[PDB]
Amino acid sequence: LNEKLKIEHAKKKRLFDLYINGSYEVSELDSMMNDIDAQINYYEAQIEA
Amino acid sequence: NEKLKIEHAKKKRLFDLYINGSYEVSELDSMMNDIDAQINYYEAQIEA
């Protein structure tokens, strides 16, 4: 499950890279980045809280 | 050389993220460091 949380972290690094590569724009980046950042919050604690 | 200008564009997009209150500066600076690192290596190639 730790990796499953690291997955959410792994997305950020790639998502930034994708945007940086010119694949995505800021507008679409924001909603996605926020959703994934939100997504982390759902899978943040639970196992250890 | 046609190797930095792509990084220049890469570095350009990263700078825009700094204006929004979102994201984390640590994430941006760390990537920026990686971006800038490739440049300095790319630059000093003429002498060798």
Cβ of A16 within 8 Å of Cβ of B10? The answer is no
On whether the CB atoms of residues A36 and A11 are closer than 8 A, the answer is yes
Entry resolution (Å): 2.5
Whether residue B30 contacts residue A9, with contact meaning beta carbons closer than 8 Å, is answered with no
- Name the closest residue on chain A to residue B8, using Cα atoms: A20
Of chain B, the end-to-end C-alpha distance in Å amounts to 15
- A40 touches A8 (CB < 8 A): yes
What is the C-alpha separation between B7 and B35, in angstroms, rounded?
Answer: 7
* Residue B9 vs residues A21, A22, A42, B13: alpha-carbon distances, Å: 8, 8, 35, 6
Residue with tokens 């929004």: B20
Q: Does B26 touch chain A (CB under 8 A)?
A: no
Spatial distance between the Cα atoms of B29 and B18, rounded to a whole number of angstroms: 10
Distance CA A14, CA B43 (A): 26
